[PDB]
DNA sequence: AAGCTTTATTGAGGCTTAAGCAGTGGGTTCCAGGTACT
DNA sequence: AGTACCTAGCTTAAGCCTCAATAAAGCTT
């Protein structure tokens, strides 16, 4: 199909833009929520070997403050992306002066390239995402409460106020889909605001482990 | 025993020599067949043969003392049946129904490589409980397994090959029918599939092994005292402790072995009702603390056979049961007179038939083993009943069951079947006439007892198997008077509905007006009520 | 269509296997133990009815009319013999028993006619 | 939960149901058979569409029913396209138009083995996945009665209103794939499995989901338990990042102490 | 959960004809315990009772294993002296017990009046329209009536508290998307108000004599006195606000 | 030498196995037997 | 002979078995 493909691409674009906005990046308001028809006009309405193919919608976004860092997103052509294919992205990545980047794979990604992605984490950070993960903004789900990343000063204030260490906080998995959505690294407390039926509002904290 | 009163609680078990088709929905088998074959008066206990259909559709066989799933075609070739046509004749009785042939085709095509009986038997010997050394001493092991291990009830002899093959083909045919669903599956809780081991069978089972141990000790003694060149002393050869202390231990302790326990319990003597209830108690072999409910539920076949209300309300609900009032367990007799009678009539044996007339007639089963064919199922059940209404040859406890939907007719003479006496109903009339009551009121004068009424062809014992093929009325005053007809084809009539209760539930006044849990609780407490439990209590 | 039966060899009395003819382009059932060839009858060598269109009249036997445990009706006469009495029952089979279809068997002796309403 | 107009339309709900239920050809086919026709132009069946061809002499003749064909809202070409996509160019499919009730698919290979054509015949009746997703059985749809499932909206005058819209209820479990489907509410669509949510919606959503599910089973019979006890159990199972199952497999894997873990069912192995 | 199964070949008992789906044949009992049950019904009644006892006997073992797992999993979860919930290894499970710090004994089911009015109904019932003369005359004493009517600062404050109520009304609707207000809270405010009425012999027919500005000031002072989280830093202030958000 | 092919290669999907399975009283039976040596 | 001395289902991790990408190795033109 072709209309299904362009609808899927538009949904992925919408979810990626929402992820970048929630992550604290410069997202233009109309780009944050554009119509499917707008996307079709802007890209070509024929992903099946046509104008709105992959690598054309690689979205480059900077930070809201300190706009030096960017994670200009990638969309591999092939379903199963591999090491020799992510090395092209690495070459383009070193061509710039930034470190973070996101790739949106179609099918299951190879375990050797999975290890490779860890193999340059200190140098430049690479995140991967499957298509079905980016067809729904899970933060919009009613079961998912408001997750807010805390700064280091806020974490120190929290620990000094409650007189507890980083070990004693309840923790959250690094492979958590919410954590992956925010791209938070290990040792980064995330405050969570959820409504309580017995107190109204309850704010908890989850360190990354 | 040692001054202690011990009661052998009857332990039920799956009925031997009977083919059953079950569904192991969790395993890799869509439908599995089995038959716990055990020849009567055989010291060796039962050996279960499994024929199970693969779920994916080949058919394999789990033989005793063989650890691999032998294909059915391999076994049939190992029985001296090389031709595929002959094997299909022994399995499928019709050559005009292509569907079952197509369904069984993958199993036939599984083992077309093996075509010789020697090769089939060599494969039989492969991967056994006792592995073979070479082609030699493994051909004989497979022959021994096929001769004396699997299907012992069809005969253990050189000439029983064709009978054993016919029975295996019947088992495969029943499995195929279960797979197509033309015959419904078999229930593990239907009491027509169960037998009750009373004191007789239990003591016989103990005595088999115990006498075997005595013989082994005698053999050891003879070996010791022949090697010296002298003559052994037979009085010192047989030691009496190995044959008496074993019974004493098995009855005093309850450990049924040197296995399961609780077989022999201490007699309960708080109340005469309690004593009667402890002597009529059935114990399920199923273990306790099981989360399943089907072995504990009150199956429909428990009507009149076992008290529906009385059961221990603890962790053994439904498992431990109390026998009903008029329920009687068949003590079993020899089937030889029945076989002689069948051969007297126009019954054809399996060793003298063509495999073509098999499908157009009814197969005859005696104690499970398939004996032959009869062309006219009617006038055969009529004749057998007429003899059971006269006590000419067939004992009253023997039960004949004519499957009418499927052309089968089975006669059971086993020791352990549970039956109850029932009235016999002619066209629309009872056979209990007024003269029977007149002669029965004047007992101790006319010497007209219950056995005289049984020999009169008025009442007869019906077991669970025959209950599935009988139309049984509540009472004569309601179900023999012309109305808007319900069935108008009654065969038996219940003597009295109140006799479906046990000994402890029969003391409940108006038990139908209560709630069933209350009746169960009363039956439990009825054994605990104090009173004069025995007349000679002062001694 | 129709079902396909298993063909049998004539010499060793085994089951025949279908095969193709390379020169005449015809189907032939061939034995594997010995070498026996025969001219096939139909092109349909395999069939599979899955929608359970199972006619039940063939599976029903006339001997069931003798069963006292089945309900009788004086409401439906026999079509062949005209006997006014006939018994009725359900399908009594798995892969079935979803619809309450009655099957009638005439209880008159030596007729055994069966039908469905 | 359906997203928009489909929630208030039974016909659109049926379309979503057909797009979610796992539909194979076995659930759609009526009967199937293989033949040996070396001349496709003149088949043994002598039907009409044989001239569409104008390569193997043995073919696959499978006939489709009309009842299941209409209910699944499929077209004949869709099935052929799915087979062609799932089998490449090794297979050829010639279908039948809507001329008669007999829906015929004729399948031939590029030349292999009849047994292989039967081998793939058993390999098609299983898993083309004609409609819906995997790991799902028949899906039941209905209108809710309790306000928990009814769409509660706030009218412009501030008054609550209970809109009764069509809701779906599956018998399998697959989020992150159903939520991807069109006309499906990605916000309110909950689940019954807990492990599946943890893979999809994270750990904190499970703490809410387990709370609602545990409250559902407790309060089903009308009994009430305070929310304080519900919150603690849900939080202690999620205070480690992952699902802390209450067994020896989950309790005895956290650093609590050798005596705590040996106080549980497994004693010697812990100490 | 269903009718009596066909234990025999397509019949529940040998006494019914085969394939009999009628009420009596499948286990329906039309008699009562006073009239007594027929033997076929009595056995079918035993069918249901045996299922009940089997459930009772098996439930004990499976359930009994359950609480042991629950208790042994949470046999060290307690409330420390900083009102936090920590396990044996001092890992915080909840910052406050039950997300509010309130024990489960001294709470009652209460109804939130702010939830589920109409917008006009909410304004009609809570705004305290001070513009009407006669309504003020009937409700308040004349010295208080002219005090409210003359001063505009009091009128501004009464408008401001209603602004908080609309803010609260939106918050509740976000917290409770479902239109229900049966919520557990510690202090039964309606009862204590009714308790206060009977203690002080209100006779509510007469105009009242409390200044509404005292009500607003008293409530604000009371909210300050209800402290779940101590301290003055904004982190504790937010926790204190969230702990008593619903109650306030 | 850039690319194709091979070959270990290495992480990622499918099968057996322990190990648990609510609380208190009352009775019964059994715990060496077999040889050896005076 | 009497007695002292010798000899029924469950579930879930968990280890184990097999299978497909992949870069090193060596040909290949
Ligand atoms: Zn041949
Ligand atoms: Zn007729």
Q: How far is the CA of C116 from the centre of ligand 2 (A)?
A: 13
Whether E72 and D264 have beta carbons less than 8 Å apart is answered as yes
Q: Do C50 and D33 touch (CB under 8 A)?
A: no
Of B70, B68, B47, B59, the residue nearest B21 (C-alpha): B59
Fold held by B20-195:
3.90.1110
Q: Which residues of D touch A198 (CB under 8 A)?
A: 227-228, 231
Tell me the C-alpha distance between B199 and E229, whole Å: 77
Tell me the C-alpha distance between A168 and D39, whole Å: 79
D270, β-bridge pairs: none
Contacts of residue D30, Cβ cutoff 8 Å, sequence gap at least 6: C49, C50, C51, C53, D63, D64, D65
Whether B83 and B59 have beta carbons less than 8 Å apart is answered as no
Dihedral (CA of D178, D179, D180, D181) sign: positive
Whether D59 and D35 have beta carbons less than 8 Å apart is answered as yes
- Strand E92-94 to E85-86 pairing: antiparallel
In angstroms, the Cα distances linking B76 to B70, B165, C8 are 11, 7, 18
Q: How far is the CA of C5 from the centre of ligand 1 (A)?
A: 17
- Strand B408-412 to B362-366 pairing: parallel
Whether A60 and A16 have beta carbons less than 8 Å apart is answered as no
Whether B332 and B348 have beta carbons less than 8 Å apart is answered as no
In angstroms, how far is F25 C1' from A99 CA?
75
Q: Would you tell me how many other CB atoms lie within 10 Å of the CB of residue B440?
A: 15
DSSP E219: H
Whether E19 and E10 have beta carbons less than 8 Å apart is answered as yes
Q: Residue D199 has which token pair?
A: 């893979």
**Interhelix angle for B98-110 vs B84-91, to 10°?**
130
Q: Would you tell me how many other CB atoms lie within 10 Å of the CB of residue E194?
A: 12
Length of chain B: 539
Angle among Cα B213, B216, B221 to the nearest 5 degrees reads 130
Q: Do E8 and B301 touch (CB under 8 A)?
A: yes
Q: How many CA atoms lie within 13 A of C2 on its CB side?
A: 8
Q: Sheet with C27-30: list strands edge to edge.
A: C17-20, C27-30, C37-39
- Closest residue of D to C24, CA-based? D38
Which helix or strand (DSSP H or E) is residue A89 part of? helix A83-95
Contacts of residue B518, Cβ cutoff 8 Å, sequence gap at least 6: none
Tell me the C-alpha distance between E241 and E235, whole Å: 10
Tell me the C-alpha distance between D118 and B351, whole Å: 40
Q: After which residues is chain B broken (C to N over 2.5 A)?
A: 56, 258
DSSP E238: H
Tell me the C-alpha distance between B265 and B285, whole Å: 15
Tell me the C-alpha distance between A137 and B272, whole Å: 77
**To which residue do tokens 């001070």 refer?**
E130
C106 marked as part of a ligand binding site = yes
Domain ranges of chain A: 1-136, 137-209
Q: Do D31 and C20 touch (CB under 8 A)?
A: no
Which helix or strand (DSSP H or E) is residue B195 part of? strand B194-197
DSSP E70: H
Strands (E), B367-417: 369-374, 399-403, 408-412
Q: Residue B525 has which token pair?
A: 């407490």
| Phi, psi at D141, each rounded to 5° | -120, 145
In angstroms, the Cα distances linking E61 to B288, D221, E56, E58 are 11, 21, 10, 6
Tell me the C-alpha distance between B66 and C53, whole Å: 41
D112, β-bridge pairs: none
Whether D179 and A11 have beta carbons less than 8 Å apart is answered as no
Whether A187 and A207 have beta carbons less than 8 Å apart is answered as yes
**Residues 25-64 (A) with a CB less than 8 A from some CB of D:** none
Q: How far is the CA of D113 from the centre of ligand 1 (A)?
A: 22
Contact present, A and B (at least 3 Cβ pairs less than 8 Å): no
Tell me the C-alpha distance between E219 and E227, whole Å: 14
Q: Would you tell me how many other CB atoms lie within 10 Å of the CB of residue E73?
A: 21
Tell me the C-alpha distance between E236 and B348, whole Å: 98
Whether C33 and B115 have beta carbons less than 8 Å apart is answered as yes
3-state percent helix, strand, coil for chain A, nearest multiple of 5:
40, 20, 45
| Phi, psi at B77, each rounded to 5° | -65, -40
Tell me the C-alpha distance between B389 and A76, whole Å: 89
Min Cα separation D44/chain C (Å): 7
Of D257, D256, D251, the residue nearest D271 (C-alpha): D257
Contacts of residue D78, Cβ cutoff 8 Å, sequence gap at least 6: D130
**Strand F close to D265 by CB, under 7 A:** yes
Tell me the C-alpha distance between E140 and E145, whole Å: 6
Length of chain D: 271
Of B432, B486, B493, the residue nearest B462 (C-alpha): B493
Q: Would you tell me how many other CB atoms lie within 10 Å of the CB of residue D178?
A: 23
**Strand F close to D266 by CB, under 7 A:** yes
Whether B23 and B211 have beta carbons less than 8 Å apart is answered as no
C9 marked as part of a ligand binding site = yes
Contacts of residue A66, Cβ cutoff 8 Å, sequence gap at least 6: none
Dihedral (CA of B91, B96, B101, B103) sign: negative
Can you tell me whether residue D196 is helix, strand or coil?
A: helix
* Right CATH for C57-116 from 3.20.20.70, 3.40.190.80, 3.40.50.1110, 2.20.25.10: 2.20.25.10
Q: Residue E164 has which token pair?
A: 């908080």
**To which residue do tokens 């994270």 refer?**
D202
Q: After which residues is chain D broken (C to N over 2.5 A)?
A: 54
Whether B297 and B189 have beta carbons less than 8 Å apart is answered as yes
Tell me the C-alpha distance between B150 and B143, whole Å: 11
Burial D192-228 (b: 16+ CB within 10 A, else e): eeeebbbebbbbbbbbbbbbebbeeeeeeeeeeeebb
Tell me the C-alpha distance between D156 and E9, whole Å: 64
Full DSSP string of A122-176: TTS-EEEEEGGGGGS-GGGSTTS-EEEEPPHHHHHHHHHHHT--TTTS-EE-TT-
DSSP C12: S
Q: Residue E17 has which token pair?
A: 């004809």
Whether D237 and D210 have beta carbons less than 8 Å apart is answered as yes
Whether B402 and E9 have beta carbons less than 8 Å apart is answered as no
Whether B256 and B206 have beta carbons less than 8 Å apart is answered as yes
**Strand F close to A115 by CB, under 7 A:** yes
Angle among Cα B123, B125, B131 to the nearest 5 degrees reads 130
Determine the distance from the C-alpha atom of residue C35 to the mean position of all C-alpha atoms in its chain, rounded to a whole number.
32
Min Cα separation E146/chain D (Å): 34
Tell me the C-alpha distance between B203 and D252, whole Å: 51
Whether B202 and B8 have beta carbons less than 8 Å apart is answered as yes
DSSP E202: -
DSSP B359: T
| Phi, psi at D252, each rounded to 5° | -85, 15
| D3 in A contact zone (CB under 8 Å) | no
Burial B194-216 (b: 16+ CB within 10 A, else e): bbbbbeebbbeebbeebeeebee
C37, β-bridge pairs: C30
Q: How far is the CA of C62 from the centre of ligand 2 (A)?
A: 10
Length of chain A: 209
**To which residue do tokens 């065969």 refer?**
B491
Q: Residue A51 has which token pair?
A: 């104008």
Radius of gyration of chain E (CA): 31
- Strand D58-64 to A171-172 pairing: unpaired
| Phi, psi at B49, each rounded to 5° | -105, 130
Q: Which residues of B touch C66 (CB under 8 A)?
A: 378, 404
Angle among Cα E139, E140, E143 to the nearest 5 degrees reads 155
Tell me the C-alpha distance between B472 and B494, whole Å: 7
- Please, which positions of strand G sit below 7 A from a protein CB? 8-10, 12-13, 21-23
Question: Which chains share 3+ C-beta pairs under 8 angstroms with C?
Answer: B, D, E
Min Cα separation E91/chain D (Å): 8
| Of residues D148, D235, D257, nearest to E88 (C-beta) | D257
Strands (E), chain D: 29-36, 58-64, 91-94, 103-109, 140-142, 151-154, 160-163, 167-169
Tell me the C-alpha distance between B109 and B94, whole Å: 20
Q: Residue A50 has which token pair?
A: 């046509």
Q: After which residues is chain E broken (C to N over 2.5 A)?
A: none
Q: Do D159 and E87 touch (CB under 8 A)?
A: no
Can you tell me whether residue B19 is helix, strand or coil?
A: coil
Whether E193 and E187 have beta carbons less than 8 Å apart is answered as no
Tell me the C-alpha distance between D103 and A44, whole Å: 38
Can you tell me whether residue B158 is helix, strand or coil?
A: helix
Q: Would you tell me how many other CB atoms lie within 10 Å of the CB of residue C31?
A: 21
Which helix or strand (DSSP H or E) is residue B49 part of? strand B47-54
């Amino acid at each position: 199909d072709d209309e299904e493909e362009t609808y899927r691409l538009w949904k992925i674009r919408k979810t990626i833009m929402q992820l970048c906005h929630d992550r604290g990046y410069l997202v233009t308001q109309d780009e944050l929520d554009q119509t499917l028809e707008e996307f079709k006009a802007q890209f070509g309405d024929k992903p099946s070997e046509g104008r709105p193919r992959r690598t054309d919608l690689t979205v480059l976004v900077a930070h809201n403050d300190d706009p030096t860092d960017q994670m200009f997103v990638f969309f591999p052509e092939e379903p199963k992306v591999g090491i020799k294919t992510i090395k092209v992205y690495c070459q383009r990545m070193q061509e710039e002066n930034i470190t973070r980047a996101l790739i949106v794979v179609q099918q299951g990604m190879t375990p050797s390239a999975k290890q490779s992605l860890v193999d340059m984490a200190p140098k430049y950070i690479l995140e991967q995402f499957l298509q079905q993960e980016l067809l729904i903004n899970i933060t919009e789900h009613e079961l998912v409460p408001e997750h807010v990343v805390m700064t280091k000063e806020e974490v120190t204030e929290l620990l000094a106020r409650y007189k507890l260490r980083e070990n004693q906080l309840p923790r959250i998995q690094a492979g958590d889909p919410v954590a992956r959505y925010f791209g938070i690294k290990r040792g980064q407390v995330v405050k969570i605001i959820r409504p309580s039926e017995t107190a109204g509002r309850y704010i908890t904290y989850r360190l990354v482990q | 025993i040692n001054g202690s009163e011990k009661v052998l609680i009857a332990q039920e078990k799956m009925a031997t020599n009977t083919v059953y088709v079950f569904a192991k929905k969790d395993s890799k088998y869509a439908y599995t067949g089995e038959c716990r074959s055990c020849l009567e008066n055989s010291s060796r206990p039962t050996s279960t043969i499994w024929v199970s259909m693969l779920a994916r559709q080949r058919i394999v066989a789990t033989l005793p003392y063989i650890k691999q799933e032998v294909p059915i075609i391999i076994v049939f070739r190992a029985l001296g049946f090389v031709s595929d046509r002959d094997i299909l004749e022994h399995i499928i009785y019709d050559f005009e129904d292509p569907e079952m042939m197509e369904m069984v085709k993958p199993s036939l095509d599984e083992a077309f490589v093996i075509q010789e009986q020697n090769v089939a038997l060599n494969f039989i010997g492969s991967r056994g409980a006792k592995p073979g050394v070479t082609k030699e001493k493994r051909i004989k092991y497979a022959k021994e397994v096929l001769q004396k291990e699997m299907l012992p009830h069809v005969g253990v002899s050189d000439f029983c090959e064709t009978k054993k093959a016919y029975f295996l083909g019947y088992m495969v045919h029943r499995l195929l029918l279960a797979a197509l669903g033309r015959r419904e599956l078999d229930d593990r809780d239907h009491y027509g599939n169960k037998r009750l081991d009373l004191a007789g069978p239990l003591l016989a089972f103990l005595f088999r092994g115990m006498f075997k141990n005595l013989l082994k000790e005698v053999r050891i003694y003879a070996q010791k005292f022949i090697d010296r060149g002298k003559d052994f002393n037979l009085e010192l050869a047989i030691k009496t402790r190995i044959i008496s202390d074993g019974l004493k231990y098995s009855l005093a302790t309850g450990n049924w072995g040197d296995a399961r326990a609780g077989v022999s319990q201490v007699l309960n003597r708080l109340t005469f009702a309690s004593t009667l209830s402890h002597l009529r108690r059935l114990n399920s072999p199923i273990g306790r603390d099981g989360k399943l409910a089907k072995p504990r539920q009150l199956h429909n076949t428990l009507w009149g056979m076992v008290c529906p209300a009385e059961t221990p309300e603890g962790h053994a609900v439904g498992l431990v049961k109390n026998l009903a009032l008029m329920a009687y367990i068949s003590v079993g007799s020899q089937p030889s007179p029945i076989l002689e009678f069948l051969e007297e009539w126009s019954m054809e044996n399996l060793e003298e038939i063509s495999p073509a007339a098999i499908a157009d007639a009814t197969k005859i089963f005696v104690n499970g083993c398939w004996v032959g064919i009869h062309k006219d199922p009617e006038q055969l059940m009529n004749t057998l009943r007429k003899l059971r209404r006269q006590m000419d040859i067939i004992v009253s406890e023997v039960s004949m069951i004519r499957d009418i939907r499927e052309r089968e007719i089975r006669i059971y003479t086993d020791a352990g079947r549970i039956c109850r006496p029932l009235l016999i109903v002619e066209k629309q009339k009872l056979l209990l006439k007024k003269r029977h009551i007149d002669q029965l009121k004047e007992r101790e004068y006319n010497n007209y007892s219950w056995q005289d009424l049984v020999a009169s062809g008025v009442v007869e014992y019906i077991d669970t198997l025959e209950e599935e093929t009988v139309m049984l009325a509540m009472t004569p005053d309601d179900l023999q008077e012309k109305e808007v007809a319900y069935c108008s084809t009654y065969t038996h009539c219940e003597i009295h509905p109140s006799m479906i209760l046990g000994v402890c539930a029969s003391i409940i006044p108006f038990p139908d007006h209560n709630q069933s849990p209350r009746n169960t609780y009363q039956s439990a407490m009825g054994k605990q009520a104090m009173g004069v439990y025995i007349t000679n209590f002062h001694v | 269509p129709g079902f396909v039966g298993i063909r049998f060899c004539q010499e060793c009395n085994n089951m025949l296997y279908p095969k193709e003819d390379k020169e005449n382009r015809i189907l032939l059932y061939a034995c594997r133990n010995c070498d026996y060839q025969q001219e096939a009858d139909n092109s349909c060598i395999y069939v599979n009815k899955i929608t359970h269109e199972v006619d039940e009249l063939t599976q029903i036997i006339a001997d069931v009319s003798q069963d006292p445990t089945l309900p009788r009706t004086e409401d439906h006469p026999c079509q062949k013999c005209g006997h006014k009495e006939a018994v009725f029952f359900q399908s009594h089979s798995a892969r079935a028993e979803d619809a309450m279809r009655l099957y009638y068997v005439c209880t008159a002796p030596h007729c055994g006619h069966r039908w469905t309403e | 939960f359906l997203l928009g107009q489909s929630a208030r339309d039974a016909e659109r709900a049926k379309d979503i149901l057909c797009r979610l239920e796992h539909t194979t050809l076995r659930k759609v086919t009526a009967n199937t058979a293989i033949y040996y026709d070396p001349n496709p132009q003149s088949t043994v069946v002598a039907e009409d569409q044989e001239w569409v061809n104008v390569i193997s002499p043995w073919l696959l003749r499978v006939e489709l029913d009309r009842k299941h064909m209409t209910d699944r809202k499929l077209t004949m070409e869709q099935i052929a396209e799915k087979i062609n996509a799932g089998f490449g160019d090794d297979l050829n499919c010639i279908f039948n138009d809507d001329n008669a009730e007999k829906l015929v698919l004729r399948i031939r290979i590029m030349n292999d083995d009849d047994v292989f054509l039967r081998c793939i015949e058993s390999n098609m009746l299983t898993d083309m996945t004609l409609q819906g997703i995997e790991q799902i059985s028949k899906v039941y749809m209905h209108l809710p009665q309790t306000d928990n499932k009814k769409k509660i909206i706030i009218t412009e005058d501030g008054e609550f209103k209970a809109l009764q819209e069509w809701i779906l209820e599956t018998d399998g479990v697959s989020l992150m794939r159903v939520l991807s489907e069109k006309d499906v509410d990605p916000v309110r669509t909950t689940s019954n499995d807990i492990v599946e949510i943890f893979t999809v919606l994270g750990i904190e959503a499970v703490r809410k989901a387990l709370e609602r599910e545990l409250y559902h089973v407790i309060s089903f019979d009308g009994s009430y338990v305070n929310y304080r006890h519900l919150a603690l159990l849900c939080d202690t199972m999620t205070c480690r990042g992952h699902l802390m199952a209450i067994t020896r497999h989950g309790v005895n894997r956290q650093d609590t102490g050798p005596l705590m873990k040996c106080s549980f069912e497994e004693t010697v192995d812990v100490l | 959960g269903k009718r009596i199964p066909f234990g025999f070949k397509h019949r529940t008992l040998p006494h019914f004809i085969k394939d009999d789906y009628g009420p009596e044949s499948r286990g329906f009992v039309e008699n009562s315990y006073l009239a007594g049950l027929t033997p076929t019904e009595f056995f079918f009644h035993a069918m249901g009772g045996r299922e009940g006892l089997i459930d009772t006997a098996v439930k004990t073992a499976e359930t009994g294993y359950i609480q042991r797992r629950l208790i042994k999993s949470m046999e060290s979860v307690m409330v420390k002296y900083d009102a936090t919930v920590r396990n044996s290894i001092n890992q915080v499970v909840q910052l406050r017990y039950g997300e509010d710090g309130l024990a489960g004994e001294s709470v009652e089911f209460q109804n939130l009046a702010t939830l589920k009015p109409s917008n006009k109904a909410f304004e009609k019932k809570f705004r305290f329209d001070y513009t009407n003369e006669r309504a003020l005359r009937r409700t308040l004493q004349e010295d208080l009536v002219k005090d409210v009517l003359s001063n505009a600062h009091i009128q501004n404050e009464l408008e401001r508290e209603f602004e908080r109520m609309r803010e609260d009304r939106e918050v509740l609707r976000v917290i409770f998307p479902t239109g229900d207000s049966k919520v557990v809270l510690p202090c039964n405010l309606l009862r204590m108000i009714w308790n206060a009425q009977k203690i002080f012999h209100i006779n509510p027919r007469l105009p009242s004599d409390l200044h509404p500005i005292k009500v607003v000031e008293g409530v604000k002072e009371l909210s300050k006195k209800l402290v779940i989280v101590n301290g003055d830093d904004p982190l504790s202030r937010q926790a204190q606000e969230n702990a008593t958000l619903l109650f306030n």
